[model samples]
Target: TAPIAITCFTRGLDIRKEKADVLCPGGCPLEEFSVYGNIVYASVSSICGAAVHRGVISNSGGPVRVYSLPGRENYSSVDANGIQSQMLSRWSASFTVTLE
Candidate 1:
């Protein structure tokens, strides 16, 4: 069977230069952030049975960090690490985000 593909869009954020505001669609209570004295911390409840396809940092000048959500085995038994590496390889062709 062909592998299922999922895509997620994220905005750019620069923690070093500017405050980052992360939000989920439809005003979902996912995560919130605030910067203070060069330190920023935020936390949010994870959605059960949800897999993160992509993560975008706001105000990021260029090249955003990409990460795979943990505990995705419940959704698929595919090697998440391998999938991440493959996705990073094709990110330029599949998405607009530039990698540094």
Candidate 2:
């Protein structure tokens, strides 16, 4: 049973925090995120799934801090369930992690 914490960075006026369970064998979409800055953008559905797909964090999960950079472009990734997802010019939630 693994758990993950997410922190999202916005345009200096707002911050977002969320939690997700990572023990699922299948890829799960992150649902704590919402439309921010009045802008509609593409984002990852699951933190652990994206991390596992990108080799950011291992399945042996622990407490960790993850953040996303908004308004970046030209990044592509897949989910843990083998589905394809892309991030570009739409507030892509790239996975950045810090362990505690």
Candidate 3:
């Protein structure tokens, strides 16, 4: 058997619709507006093992998106009279918003 592989995906968007013309096609580019101010965190875990996580802060959202990159893998074994195998994995990311 081979280990299970996982990755992360994220995007930032400007919630305000004021600068549509210069920032984006339909609306301002998601990265252009500073609604939340580019703060993000992520984590991953499995049903039968430990988990790992990390966080980052960006002054601007233009290039703030980050992924596990090199990717992550976990390995496990199964045992049964009839033979069975199962895999369970999960990932999550969070951001904060402040009202002025």
Candidate 4:
């Protein structure tokens, strides 16, 4: 996808890694973000339709990890189908965390 290749930088740890961490396609609208120490939390809307890839914690060979947002449905109406990692319903994207 066009929004992949997400890059991340650290405190010159020499163990940093990047990601296609973007939740979806098109211009992923940023809803909110909070910075606490080396952790960062953010959100973006679906680029295709709805997002199904929810339980991703980390990439294959990276020190950084990913986490799903908690209580996301309360604020955003993200109805993801409990099937495969896909998008077709157009939902609110959030909770994409990182260890930078």
Each candidate's clash count = 8, 3, 0, 5
Off by over 4 Å in 3: 1-53, 58-68, 75-100
Best-performing candidate as measured by TM-score: 2
* Best of the two (2, 3) by TM-score: 2
| Superposition TM-score, candidate 1 onto the true structure | 0.17
Off by over 4 Å in 2: 1-42, 77-89, 92-95
- The worst-scoring run of ten residues by lDDT in candidate 1 lies at 36-45
What's the TM-score of each model vs. the native?
0.17, 0.38, 0.16, 0.21
lDDT of each: 0.20, 0.37, 0.20, 0.27
- Model 3: weakest 10-residue lDDT segment is 45-54
Name the TM-score of candidate 4: 0.21
> Clashes in model 3: which pairs?
none
Model 4 regions lying over 4 Å from their true place = 1-5, 8-40, 45-62, 70-91, 96-100
Q: Give the per-residue lDDT digits (tens) of candidate 4, residues 32-79.
A: 211211111223322121122222322222222344433223232232
What's the lDDT for candidate 4? 0.27
For model 3 the local lDDT of residue 59 reads: 26
Clash pairs detected, candidate 2: 29-45, 30-45, 30-46
> Per-residue CA lDDT of candidate 2, range 1-100, in tens?
4453334222112222342332233323443322222111234434443443444445533343445444455555433324345445545443343343
lDDT per residue (tens digit) for residues 1-100 in model 3: 2221221121212221221111111211222211211122112221111111112222211112222322222423332222222322321332222211
